Amino acid sequence: DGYMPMS
Amino acid sequence: WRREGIKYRRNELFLDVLESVNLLMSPQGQVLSAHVSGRVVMKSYLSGMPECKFGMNDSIAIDDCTFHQCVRLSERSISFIPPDGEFELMRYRTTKDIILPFRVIPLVREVGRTKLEVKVVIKSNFKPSLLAQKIEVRIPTPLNTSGVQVICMKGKAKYKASENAIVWKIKRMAGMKESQISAEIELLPTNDKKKWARPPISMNFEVPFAPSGLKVRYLKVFEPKLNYSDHDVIKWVRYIGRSGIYETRC
């Protein structure tokens, strides 16, 4: 899948 | 370039860290050459004329880089006003403290002049929570190969004679694991004074992390004029390290 959320 | 009337319902950005890890190892297992080429590509839909601070853990040793033209050079990190759409922020290169996602351990046993006994083991070396994917291992055969028999527990393998390689392919494989393949290479006769110099075994893989250990700390968006602030922007990041030239001598 795309990305993971910034943190 | 970037016009002034830019307004978006969802103010999103996507950060791509694209790394290409290159490695030349001995059959013993000593690194003979290794570097990482990298670039950071931004795909963003933000309203206005944003001021963007990009922050990483420069910790890691970055060995050079070229920027895009809207970068305020002066940690000292990177501030910039990004074009709408998609553009490449920075482009760096690394040689120290590199994660080598796979070890390739080759083993070759001559058998008279008829057979060649070959065993090749790949050792994944990263968080087992993480999956490498698009894994290919290339094993060259000699030219006087009459035929090839192979076995492998994971993935698939054919002998491609047009290419004089056994190509072993593995859809996915988790960190800290092992897979091995085994071939019997049936040989024709040839000019015996001319021995066979063993071309390296090469690998291709893809991994959800940067093998240079670069991480992204912050990307703070600041809009003076318009009534959105930093904690309003949807931010996303992925790392996509791929094999460059990645060869174990044998």
Residue numbers in the entry:
A (entry chain B): 610 to 616
B (entry chain A): 161 to 218, 240 to 255, 260 to 435
List sentences from the manuscript.
We next determined the crystal structure of AP2M1 (residues 160–435) bound to the serine-phosphorylated YXXΦS motif from IRS1 (pS-IRS1). The overall structure of the AP2M1–pS-IRS1 complex was similar to those of previously determined structures of AP2M1 bound to YXXΦ motifs. AP2M1 contained two interlinked β-sandwich subdomains: subdomain 1 (β1–6 and 17–19) and subdomain 2 (β7–16). The pS-IRS1 peptide binds at the edges of strands β18 and β17 in subdomain 1, and interacts with residues from strands β1, β17, and β18. In particular, Y612 and M615 make extensive hydrophobic interactions with AP2M1. The hydroxyl group of Y612 forms a hydrogen bond with D176 in β1, providing an explanation for why phenylalanines cannot functionally substitute for tyrosines. Isothermal titration calorimetry (ITC) measurements confirmed that the phospho-serine IRS1 peptide (pS-IRS1) indeed bound to AP2M1 with higher affinity (Kd = 280 nM), as compared to the unphosphorylated peptide (Kd = 2.03 µM). We did not observe well-defined electron density for pS616 in IRS1, despite its ability to enhance the IRS1–AP2 interaction. pS616 is located in the vicinity of a positively charged patch on AP2M1 formed by residues K405, H416, and K420, suggesting that the phospho-serine might engage in favorable electrostatic interactions with this basic patch. Thus, consistent with the lack of electron density, pS616 does not make defined electrostatic interactions with specific acceptor residues, and interacts with the positively charged patch as one structural entity. The YXXΦS motifs containing phospho-serine and unphosphorylated tyrosine are optimal ligands for AP2.
Insulin binding to IR promotes clathrin-mediated endocytosis of the insulin-IR complex, which regulates the intensity and duration of signaling. AP2M1 binds to YXXΦ motifs and promotes clathrin-mediated endocytosis. An IVT IRS2 fragment (residues 520–888) containing seven putative YXXΦ motifs also bound to GST-AP2M1, and mutations of four such YXXΦ motifs (Y649A/Y671A/Y734A/Y758A) greatly reduced IRS2 binding to AP2M1. These results suggest that IRS1 and IRS2 directly bind to AP2M1 through multiple YXXΦ motifs. Thus, IRS1/2 bind to AP2 through canonical YXXΦ motifs in vitro and in mammalian cells, and promote insulin-activated IR endocytosis.
